Amino acid sequence: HMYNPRCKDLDRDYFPSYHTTRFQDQPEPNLAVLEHFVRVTKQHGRELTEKQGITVDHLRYGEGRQLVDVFYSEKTTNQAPLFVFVHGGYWQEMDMSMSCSIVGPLVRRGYRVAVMDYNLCPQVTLEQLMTQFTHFLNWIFDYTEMTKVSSLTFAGHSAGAHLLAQILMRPNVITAQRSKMVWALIFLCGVYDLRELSNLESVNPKNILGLNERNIESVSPMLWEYTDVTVWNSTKIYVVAAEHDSTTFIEQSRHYADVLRKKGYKASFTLFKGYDHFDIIEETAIDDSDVSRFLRNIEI
Ligand code: NA
Structure with a gap:
């Protein structure tokens, strides 16, 4: 148990849902929180285009x-x-329909917002999802370039934060000019070192992530040898943990922020009071929420 010197149970430290303070009168608060997350995020999604006057274009960067x-x-x-x-x-659950809480306040602040979906493990190995995600980063810059727009911000949550980390190490796609377009990268409650969870059946059953010893460094942003850091020094990097996440998740973020800082990235760590791993997203649909205020404050 790296990241939690005082851990008793390594598995539960890898499921953020056991770590909330919500629904504590529920017999299984971890299932309550998941149920609630699914429900409210689907509702945010419908409210965007049925109530909030927001328009959506349905595009594709790949099949399915x-x-x-x-x-x-x-x-x-x-x-x-x-x-x-x-x-x-x-890398094995969630879809577009539960991913759009973040949209509404941003559109009201004058952004266009791209919410993406991806193929899940084991239809791909994580390595292959990562190659596909590289196709996505290329797509998003081609799209922005065509639109002759030259300011972007990326944010990922959980597994999505993990995925987003490759933006720092794909220079055959991310040119120096593309890098200069990025105002900020926001890593919400991600995981960055997969060596522990790679060996757990509760997280990686029957090895559906398709992991092993040759590729464990490549799927672990924590362990990479970052190079050409200078092209990112126009870009602010925010690594964020929720206060009510597992100590493992919290420390993974703290340590990843340390790694980036030590490499010379303009990175910071934030422990966000009052949030768990889930409502930190749920509350992005509320313009006045703390998390919303945080995202807004990044603009200054
Ligand atoms: Na712009």
Whole structure:
């Protein structure tokens, strides 16, 4: 138990749902929280286009679930900045319909918002999902370039934070110019070192992540040898943990922030009071929420 010197149970430290303070009168609060998350995020999604006057374009960067929905207000110019959101779900669950809580307040602040979906393990190995995600980063920059827009922010949650980390190490796709377009990278409650969970059946049953010893460094942002850091020093990096996450998740974020800082990235660690791993996303649908205020404050 790296990341939790005082851990008793390594598995439960890898399921953030056991770590909330919500639904503590529920016999299984971990299932309550998941149920609630599914429900409210689907509701946020419908409210975006049925109530909030927001428009969506349904696009694709690949076959099947490799989709990108772009949300915008027609009352706003087409040359607005683009905010990109990458959803979580341990590379094996979640979809677009539960991923759009973040959209509404951003559109009201004058962003266009791209919410993407991806193929899940074991339809791909994690390595292959990562190659596909590289196709997505190429797509999003081609899309922004075509639109002749040259300001972006990316944010990923959980597994999505893990995925987003490769943006720092794909220079055959991410040119110096592409890098210079990025205002900020936001890593919400991600995981960055997969050596412990790779060996657990509860997280990686029957090895559906398709992991092993040759590729464990490559799927672990924590362990990479970062190079050409200088092209990112126009980009602010925010590594964020929720206070009510597992100590393992919290420390994974703290340590990843340390790794980046030590490499010379403009990175910071934030422990966000009052949130667990889930409501930190749920509350992004509320303009006045603490998390919303945080995202807004990044702009300054
Ligand atoms: Na711009």
